[PDB]
């Protein structure tokens, strides 16, 4: 039983690759061009979509994916080149998945609005903004969140099996 | 007659794999841009084209074609690695697609109107909207779903010759 | 003489398949965008160019490239996975041509107006549109119709030399 | 001297192949959104550019460049399968290359103009109208031009010292 | 402890290269088209554009990634062919990472405003511009300055230990 | 001292390619789209672009780096097919190579202008015009001016050492 | 008592003239210049205007004002030419200025509001239309309506003193 | 009772004039600015105008206000200057109040549409126009078919009177 | 002095009735016109200003100018017609003047501003609008205020003269 | 019966200024503002519509109207400050109505057409022009032609009567 | 020669007169609505304009023209209703006409520029505009002024025939 | 004879009144609105036309006119308060009549242009401009011209007879 749970993991993570590396894309594609404001201001729009939107979800899901495969490159250089570093590496992969996955939640929430309303310079008093596409973006944070809670579940499993405390 | 059909199951994946990755990409390319309604409100495009398309068929169809290749992939690496798998996967593979086929026919039915009438804030009252390319569309639903019914139809022939109950 | 008739037969279908690749996803790039009507109504010009082309040329041929390439594809499978063979799918290649080209007949015929007369709801009585590039979509019809048509004269040469009735 | 001549054969089919491969796709990109007629009629754009550039010189020249390399292929394959071919074959190079050369000088000529009257229906009377960037494409066919000259020459060198009428 | 640095070198140098290589092409693809400026007057967009962002932050990390790798290439080419070359590569190498580093803060600073005044002809008197995604592009700024600071850090290290002075 | 020297060569001509492959093919993608002039003359915009830009640089650089490597290739070609070949390829090379650089002096100078005045027709007589982005062009100018010096000075150096007169 | 009451008949009349003839004619300029409604279809403001506003306010109050002076004029005619007329008169005026009174009643009500909603072809479903200067055209009604009504119960009161039934 | 009839007459001659000149200059003000087609042609709002209404009401009524006045000014100016010019000057009146009742039914009949479908070059097939304040303008049409009615019966009775045959 | 009052009481009427009548009637003109607010919403502008400007001053004045005038004319008709009505017409006078001062007062304060934020639907929450020709009309305003007020402060001296209580 | 004559050209004159002054000021208000030419060219419409109509029909019949009246305004102001004037003036009147006459048949034909092409400077080649109210004013040029020639032959009744050669 | 002086007083008032009613009605007609200035923001062409032109130079005119003509028609009354009178209306006419003379050198100068630059809210910083007709204007003040004067010279030469001190 | 050339001298003073007075208003009621310059900067369209037209030949004209008829006035007002002033006006209408022809002829000329080409601040270089309605305006002009020298020369007549030096 904890035998296939590497096969498991491994399997995991190339779906992971492959979902955000064919479709993701192309989701995010418009997000500037079709976010409009209700106003005649110039330079109300580039405003009130750069609070909204600081970072966009597809470069921090990119950024994640590249970061947590660091370990496995370094052991693997290691012993290219030539029992601790198994232990080491399997505690960074613990911290980093953790630490990226609260980071998601502290970021983004679980859904994306259809209406936002933003009071940024230029703009005059408060004024209303309306986003594209908001369901299957959110669909998406969903997904994404279930897939690294499922990878974080795995890592720990492993962890204790070797580690004591 | 039960042999070659193994043959035709490898050949129709891989058909569909080919027509969704080829011609797919392209129909759906200008859904957006290309729709439009009868109003002077900002804001009433972009939530009526999200009530009326909240996933586009295109990713749902990619979604579907990668995770109905899993349980191969398991079974593939399990062996790298190194009979009960070979059932468990077969049972698998046709709870997989039976939900997608079944999910598909309720998401999108068996056609895609030219008009919609939407009546979603900000827009005021009922308003009218006008589809591009709807023959297109419909024409490609239903090739998709001909070519997953021969698919799950495929697949109950060999869990009986092989299974009991 | 006999015996060159299949290299020939190769010949053509790799210089088909060359042509349609690399220069035809380019000549319809634009066909909706620089579509245009004689008319102030909204939607008239997405109703009209759907009934003008409910089907691009280019989606009809990428398609039929793919599928008259199947029995081929079953045949080399076969034989990896371990006369009959041969004969029927001579047979399936040569009802899949005619089909191909009669369709093709069918539904394109032999040029492209410049102009078109819609008469399709919310237009109103019968307006006047507008074709992009009519001569070099008349030119690529007509070339691959002769394409096609040698391609189904080779394929009868070697049905009547193996089969009698 | 004539030994050599068959390696200049080679490196020039090559360079020809280059030069319209990597640079070539992107002259012509804008050819026709940067075409503009002084006009108020719907449709007169359309027509005026068809009646200008029936074929746009790219599309000849990547049709050329696929037909001349057919007899080699068909040759190639012969000896894969498996002198009257080698004669036969230059026989066909020697006519197709002719041919096209006489065909690029009637449709096209040595120079693009700059400004084109058109008068085509929905025109009113005769309009001006003005093309984008004409100097690179007149280099452009002035250069291909010499080098299927070039190639012209070279392919009659080797026909008169095997062959003798 | 000194014999892993090379190792976290090597995978800090290919960590850089992936994350300009698949992320950064993305942000900087709409930068002028989405710069607007407060005025009436043909022309100013372009000039206040130019003075702002003389070169954008994309072109000369490549560069840099580039022009870093050359003492390496040389190095190898040499062998190929085929101690002093060790030590003067890197001396290179130590001299190029700090002229890049400090050029880098020279050039851009820690931080991209939202907000630029711009007084440059055609423009009258001075000019209020809107720039677009400044927290996107500052973050980015920042991570790329500590990763170039850690490869900095890293060839010293090696330096002293082969060094004296 | 000399021995070194083929190595520098070697390594310059990549670099070369790859600034010019990856970087260039995108600082001139909106080259015509952003140029404006002061006028309400149709075609007037297109007339004048034409004059102040009849060739682009980066066109002219791909067709340098291309035809700069034609002797080699025909050298290789020529000992795969089976000493007066080097002198000979090393002559056709110092002399392509000072043809292209006093062409590219004379062709563009030293500097990319933000103003352009413009008289042809159908512009009414003399308009003022703008450019995008002078500064980054400009920078490119240079460099490659430079890098092409170094080629030349470099190819010298071996032409003396084996050449007499 | 009964004396003064005819002064107040005339005074009356000549305030009600002088106040419809020099201030009632600009209020009413812009009626149909600034009525607009939420929509895209030509020809949906004319028809919803007019459904609307079928008789504008000031032209029934100028054509009541002149037909309500007719019998006296009769009156005076006579008399010129040359105690019967004088009753018959005063039925006739009491007849037109209740007729009068009523039909204002029926045709306008006792304000104007804001918002107006139609449903009349060309337009699509309903839509809503916006009205220009409320508030003044409803106390222009309202004061009008005052003065009427006055008039109305100064012509009854001579009535009855000469009448009997 | 014949005798009060002459009173009436001059009542119903000045009321006419007063209401034509006082109310109907400004209901026509604003007939051709706000007539619309649905159209995309240059000159074909003024061709269809021009066939919907060639003669405006007002000028036909005010041309016929004058030209019934004749007579009696002929007559007036004889007494001046110094029995058989009164009964021919009857004749004339009741001539030219005939002709223009039967002319202003055979023009106008008795309403104006709220649409209007024209067909005139340089229109494209026919078109879908639409007019402005319709009820207002056949109201207006009524009454002065009404009043001029009566005006016509009027001085029938007269003639008879004075007239044998 | 107290004989002189009456002549300035005649003057400063004729002298209101002049500056109304004369210049007041174009400051005005344009008051709907050019009002302007920063927004994009149908109908948004009709609710502000009918809410910032209910009633236009000019009409007021010139309400006020006729209505004041009114006892004048009843006493001159009743003199007419054939020492109580001096003194009855005196205190209506009075009575009249000091209501229509207060009332100005009330409805129109001291000054114009320049800006007024509206909040009235269909605007969406609080908007800013801007006037047209603040300074002009608060100067008129406070000379219409000054020269009525000398006419109430004249009307109060005659009634105490002859006035006990 | 010439006696009536003098009282049929005095009715005749008062009629024509009648028309004159009261219908034509308002058919020819538009004359410009709703004439439109089918360019793009600045000017264009300008010059076309000063070629069209060099001086318009209204200023024309004003000027005759005016200054066919000045001998009779001669001969008054003589008999005033105090039979060979009565001759003179007739003579003169004589001759000023048959050039006038001559003159308009000259000028203007006998009607306006519909559409009008222009060839002047600046416009491109010949382009086409289209008029306002073609109907209306071809009625009014034929009815201003009949009174005309109706008083040209009543002046010559006198002139020979009186007139010997 | 002071007899005459009066006659040319009264003179030059008439001309004053004549001269502001006549013409300077429509010099100003447009001032507003020609009116530019170089920016983008709303409400900046509002507030630059009061801040440029206060208070009209027509409208101070005619007051100027109304206000000096009331001691005249004071003393014209008194007349009426029935020497100290004249000396004291000469005092006051005196005063009046050095007040206003003062008071227009103060508001306006002797000049109208034809730029002008603002930097009112809601501008950004400083703006710059545009005026009207400046020459024309320019040239009224002046011979106003200097009318003006010559009014003030003639009332203090008799002034100081009569007056002592 | 000379005794007749005054009842001309009144005849043609009126003929000029009426003139300008009755059509003179409305040749250049549109004479801004419709001049148009080849430019898109703001405010070159004010400067242009200041620069082309100082001062509009209709305002001189009514100046002229005003100020030729004041030695009358004084003369006639000397009378009514009541052979030297008949000289001294005289001499004085004498004056003013060529002093007024003089400068006539200095400001205009003889005709008005089609085009002007104006380089005045805030536009680029030079740029042309076009003008509406030349040849009704040189007609005017010319007929002025002439009208005026009628009357100089009249003038002069009378001086003669009574004058000596």
Not at 37 to 56: H, M, V, W
Not at 79 to 91: D, G
Not at 135 to 142: A, W
Request: with cysteine; glycine share 6%.
């Amino acid at each position: 039983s904890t035998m296939i749970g590497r096969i498991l993991l491994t399997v995991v993570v190339i779906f992971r690759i492959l979902i955000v590396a064919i479709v993701g894309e192309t989701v995010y594609d418009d997000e500037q061009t079709m976010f409009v404001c209700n106003t005649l201001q110039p330079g109300c729009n580039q405003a009130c979509y750069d609070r909204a939107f600081p970072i966009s979800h597809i470069r921090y899901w990119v950024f994640q994916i590249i970061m947590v495969c660091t370990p496995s490159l370094c052991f693997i250089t290691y012993s290219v080149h030539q029992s601790r570093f198994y232990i080491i590496q399997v505690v960074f992969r613990n911290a980093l998945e953790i630490g990226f996955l609260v980071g998601q939640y502290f970021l983004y929430g679980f859904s994306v609005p259809g209406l936002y309303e933003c009071n940024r310079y230029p703009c005059i008093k408060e004024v209303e903004c309306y986003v594209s596409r908001p369901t299957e973006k959110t669909v998406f944070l969903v997904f994404m969140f279930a897939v690294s809670g499922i990878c974080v579940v795995l890592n720990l499993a492993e962890l204790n099996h070797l580690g004591w405390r």
